[PDB]
């Protein structure tokens, strides 16, 4: 028998990459591929915002003088923030911009662990020289899709959590060029991440989840 090993992990772009498992035997290629696609797509640790606390606004369906968007638009934009933390789960950020100009993820005061991978993400647009916006974004780890309905002060606004560092996984079993033994194939897996997870770590973690779940009937 032959046991696959990671050989080449290329990164065409910062979001999507291509992992390769070279020495896969006949049959096990597709079997490994489908399982490693489902596990990768469904269960993978990731960080996303959970609670946002603006300075002046009270509820979600309320405008704010100085911001070109409703608070609902700001919350929706905040939901799609690619934040990678290194340490504790609950970490609270702070944004403070005053002046006409599109606020971005760079304006968020970075701490020693949190590092925003996309500094150009636009949150809101200030349209006056005498306007100011301040928020307290709480970012916590998670797994899967946790709505805001299942999960107290009037100021606090709840935003649905979408912890998923993987967006699009597509594999393709190609016939390997291993000359000594024929019928061998390689498994090329392409993963479109959001910029928080590393392809090698994600692949390894999915494989280990499969391994732990395999210990039941063994």
């Amino acid at each position: 028998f032959l046991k696959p090993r990671l050989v080449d992990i290329e990164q065409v772009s910062s979001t999507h990459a291509k992992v390769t498992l070279e020495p896969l035997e006949r049959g096990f290629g597709h079997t490994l591929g489908n399982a490693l696609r489902r596990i990768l797509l469904s269960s993978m640790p990731g960080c996303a915002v959970t609670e946002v606390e603006i300075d002046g606004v009270l509820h979600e369906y309320s405008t704010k003088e100085g911001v070109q968007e409703d608070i609902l638009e700001i919350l929706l934009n905040l939901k799609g923030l690619a934040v990678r933390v290194q340490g504790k789960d609950e970490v609270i950020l702070t944004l403070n911009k005053s002046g006409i100009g599109p606020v971005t993820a760079a304006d968020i005061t970075h701490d020693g662990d949190v590092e925003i991978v996309k500094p150009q993400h636009v949150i809101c647009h200030l349209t006056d020289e005498n306007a100011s916006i301040s928020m307290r974004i709480k970012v916590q780890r998670g797994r899967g899709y946790v709505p805001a309905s299942t999960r107290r002060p009037i100021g606090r606004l709840l935003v649905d959590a979408c912890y998923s560092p993987v967006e699009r996984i597509a594999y393709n079993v190609e016939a390997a060029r291993v000359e000594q033994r024929t019928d061998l194939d390689k498994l090329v897996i392409e993963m479109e991440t959001n910029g928080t997870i590393d392809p090698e770590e994600a692949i390894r973690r999915a494989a280990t989840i499969l391994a732990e779940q395999l210990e039941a009937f063994v």
Partner: protein, 50 residues
């Protein structure tokens, strides 16, 4: 005549998609949503987009 003051309070909910909500098209094809299938179980084309 006879009332002193009235108070009106407005409540706002955010309904989402639930199994049973009718969702039809423009041409005339109608039908309720049956099951919210997870993304991984939905059919995916060659490029991977489900």
């Amino acid at each position: 005549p006879g009332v002193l003051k009235i108070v009106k309070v407005y409540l706002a909910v955010k309904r989402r998609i639930q199994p049973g909500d009718k969702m039809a098209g423009r041409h005339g094809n109608k039908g309720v949503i049956s099951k919210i299938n997870p993304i991984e179980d939905m059919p995916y084309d060659e490029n991977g987009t489900p």
